[PDB]
């Protein structure tokens, strides 16, 4: 199907405990393939040269310094003291369709958890969150940064994502369907919980819903966040509280990429 490549970078100052830590992690969809950590690889990555690895190592080193200097600049923009710790995050990368062509590129930043600046979908213009980010925007417009970012996103990003998908196809292009069952747990004489499970699926995207008499139970469904199992796969469950004796009015519905057709499940006593 469709795929994404995304880098998640975190720079965090720590006054009195050295220079800010910089960590960059790269993903294809829900598979991490690279990590660089200033505080010191997928198999289909090792098959690239040691030259590929050096070139990316150099980039990580330069990025470390750029984000460190940016943290300094940002505390200035917000009139902040040197005493506190602050965080600069960024996400960049590309989404492609089944044919491998660019759907959309991304390059955006947050400071202390708050959106700061983002490259617009046009890959030519910026959206700044506040008067500080407007400084960054003006500097980046003057230095024609968006043109460099666009070149990466339309070129390097798409080209390498295509290569990774080809070299890592047995995993990256394999969707593993959820294994599903419904469990039943009495709460009292009067009510029981029905819990619909999805286990062992990849990628993480999934839809799990309960219906009662064919009606969506959005407000009455407890949905846990999709969670990693540790073996590349993910897990999720959805639960509803039902009156004793009424269990057969409830159906669990599962949609996932690895499924030929959606599942409809009920409790089977």
């Amino acid at each position: 199907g469709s795929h994404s490549m995304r880098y998640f970078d975190t720079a965090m100052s720590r006054p009195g405990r050295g220079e800010p830590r910089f960590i960059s992690v790269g993903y294809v969809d829900d598979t991490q393939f690279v990590r660089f950590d200033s505080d010191a690889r997928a198999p289909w990555i090792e098959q690239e040269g040691p030259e590929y690895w050096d070139r990316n190592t150099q980039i990580f080193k330069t990025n470390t310094q750029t984000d460190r200097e940016s943290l300094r600049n940002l505390r200035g923009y917000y009139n902040q003291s040197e005493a506190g710790s602050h965080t600069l995050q960024s996400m960049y990368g590309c989404d492609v369709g089944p044919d491998g062509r660019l759907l959309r590129g991304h390059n955006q930043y947050a400071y202390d958890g708050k959106d700061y600046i983002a490259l617009n979908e046009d890959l030519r213009s910026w959206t700044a969150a506040d008067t500080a980010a407007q400084i960054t925007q003006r500097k980046w417009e003057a230095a024609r940064v968006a043109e460099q970012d666009r070149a990466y996103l339309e070129g390097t990003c798409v080209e390498w994502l295509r290569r990774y998908l080809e070299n890592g196809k047995d995993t990256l292009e394999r969707a593993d369907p959820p294994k599903t069952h419904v469990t039943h747990h009495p709460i009292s004489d009067h009510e029981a919980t029905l819990r619909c499970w999805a286990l062992g699926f990849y990628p993480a995207e999934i839809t799990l819903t309960w219906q009662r008499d064919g009606e969506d139970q959005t407000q009455d469904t407890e949905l846990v966040e999709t969670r990693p199992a540790g073996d590349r796969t993910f897990q999720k469950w959805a639960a509803v509280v039902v009156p004793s004796g009424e269990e057969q009015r409830y159906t669990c519905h599962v949609q996932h990429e690895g499924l030929p057709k959606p599942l409809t499940l009920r409790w089977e006593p």
């Binding site: 880098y7 970078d9 960059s24 790269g26 690279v34 590929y52 990316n56 980039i59 990580f60 330069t62 990025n63 750029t66 984000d67 200097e69 940016s70 600049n73 940002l74 600069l88 960024s90 960049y92 390059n107 930043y109 700061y116 600046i117 960054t136 500097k139 980046w140 230095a143 940064v145 460099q148 970012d149 990466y152 390097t156 990003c157 080209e159 390498w160």
Partner: peptide
């Protein structure tokens, strides 16, 4: 493949 961040904010 990573992208150079060569411009300070």
């Amino acid at each position: 493949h990573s992208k150079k961040k060569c411009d300070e904010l």
